[PDB]
């Protein structure tokens, strides 16, 4: 039997790396901003 969903999400928030998550999310926001800027012209 697998784990329930909420303890799995809280454990993924508890034990994962913070710096890699921060860098990937910030570069994802940057890529979305470049897409929006390319759409605006």
């Amino acid at each position: 039997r697998e784990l329930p969903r909420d303890v799995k999400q809280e454990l993924q928030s508890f034990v994962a790396d913070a710096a890699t998550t921060l860098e990937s999310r910030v570069k994802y926001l940057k890529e979305l901003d470049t897409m929006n800027q390319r759409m605006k012209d």
Binding site: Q9, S13, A18, L22, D33
Partner: peptide, 24 residues
């Protein structure tokens, strides 16, 4: 849960402060 709130909002703050490009 606090680490989840930090992983939610802290990328937005670090994007706005550090690596937001110049506008117009």
């Amino acid at each position: 849960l606090i680490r989840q709130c930090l992983r939610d909002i802290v990328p937005v703050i670090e994007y706005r402060n550090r690596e937001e490009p110049a506008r117009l």
